[PDB]
Design a protein around this nucleic acid. Sequence first.
DNA 1: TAGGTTAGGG
Length: 183
Amino acid sequence: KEPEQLRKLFIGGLSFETTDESLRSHFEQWGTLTDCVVMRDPNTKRSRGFGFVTYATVEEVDAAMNARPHKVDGRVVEPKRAVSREDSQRPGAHLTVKKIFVGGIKEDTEEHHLRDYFEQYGKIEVIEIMTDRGSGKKRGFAFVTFDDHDSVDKIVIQKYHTVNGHNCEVRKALSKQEMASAS
DNA sequence: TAGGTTAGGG
C-alpha cells in the first residue's frame, strides 16, 4: 500500500449537481475507490465545485489520468495529482505548468544526466542548463519542459530526485513576475 | 478548480 497522498486525485471544475455518488460512479471505472467526496461549504452545504477520489493503488490513479479528458455529469472536469496540505502552502503549488525548476545540480551536469532521470516521467520537449550571461559560468540549476502538465505533477509530489549522481530539488517553474511576486 | 486534519508538558 502506497501512501494515501499518492493514491489520491483532486477533481476541479466539478458540476453543481455532482455528488459523492455521481463522482464515484464515474471514477470507479478505472479502479477500486477507497475514498470519494465532493467538498461543500461547511454551512450551506452548497458544493464548492471540487472534490477528491482515492484508489487502492497508484497504478489505478495513472490509469485514470491516461483516461483524460474526463466529463462528469455533463461537465468537463479537471483531474490532478493531490498536492499535500503542507505543499499547497507554497507559492503557485496549484498552477498547471509544463516546466520544472531543477536546483542544485553539479557543474559537470550534462543534458544526458537530466534525461536519464526525467524521461521516465514523460515526453521531454526542452532542456536548459543555465549559465551566466557573458561569464559562461554554470549557475547550478536547469529548466525541463514536458508535453503534459501531469508529468510535472507526478514529479513535484515526490521528495527526492537523483541527477548526475546526487539529489536535487525540483519545483514547478514560476515566471519572472510570479517569482518576484512570491518574494 | 485546494481538503473532510498541525506545537505538549515536562
